Amino acid sequence: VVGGTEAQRNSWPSQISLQYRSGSSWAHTCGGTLIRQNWVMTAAHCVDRELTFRVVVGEHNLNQNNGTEQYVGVQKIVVHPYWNTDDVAAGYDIALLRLAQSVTLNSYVQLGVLPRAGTILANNSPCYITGWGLTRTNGQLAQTLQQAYLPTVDYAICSSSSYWGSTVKNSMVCAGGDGVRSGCQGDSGGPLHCLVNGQYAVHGVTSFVSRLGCNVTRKPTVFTRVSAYISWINNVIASN
C-alpha cells in the first residue's frame, strides 16, 4: 500500500496474509479475506503456482507474534474456471482457499462481509485498501499492515481512454488513481473495504496496476468485483 498509514492493530480482522513456504520459513506473497472459519478469498494469480500455502489470521506485524495470530495451512485451492494465468486484464482473477483447520473466530479474526450480488458502487465511494505490499513504489514490503483511502472510480471513467480504457472489464473495480495512494506488489488478493450506509464490505480483490508503477495518476488500482462472483463463491463453498 503506497501513501497509506499503519492500520490500527486488527481493525480489519478479516484481512489475512497469504504466505508460501520458502526454505525453512514462510514468506508473505499476498493478502486475502477470510469469509468462513475455513475459507479465504484471494486473487487467482496468487495461487496458480504449485507452492505450499499457509494463511495467517489476526496478523498485523509479519515479523513478531503478538499473540493474536493464528497460522493455518491451505488444504485446497479453487481458482475461478475462467481465469487466464496469462491475461490478468481478462478478469476472473479470484480464488477460494479451503483451510486445513478452521480458524477460531474472535475479535482479531472475523469474516469479511461481502456485497449483495451485483452491487455497483457509485463513483467515488469511500473505500480503504489494506495490505503488506510495498509502501513506496519500487521500495520494500511492509512489516505492519498498511491502509489507504482509495475511493472508487466508476466504470464510465475507469474505462475511458485517459484511464484504463479497454483494459478494465465490467467485472472489476477501480479505486484511487490520484497518483499518491494505491496498492502495490504484495497487496494482491487483499480486500478493498468500502463503506456503504455505515456498513463496510469487501467489494474488491486486489488484482493489478500499470506497468508504469503503483501510484500512477489515472491508473487506479484495479480489483476483481466481488459482487460479480457471489454466485460462484457460494457454489464453491457449498460443494466443497
Binding site: C30, H45, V88, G183, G189, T206, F208, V209
Partner: peptide, 7 residues
C-alpha cells in the same frame, strides 16, 4: 497491467 503479487 502487472499484478500486485511479483506477478
Amino acid at each position: 497491467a502487472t499484478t500486485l503479487x511479483x506477478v
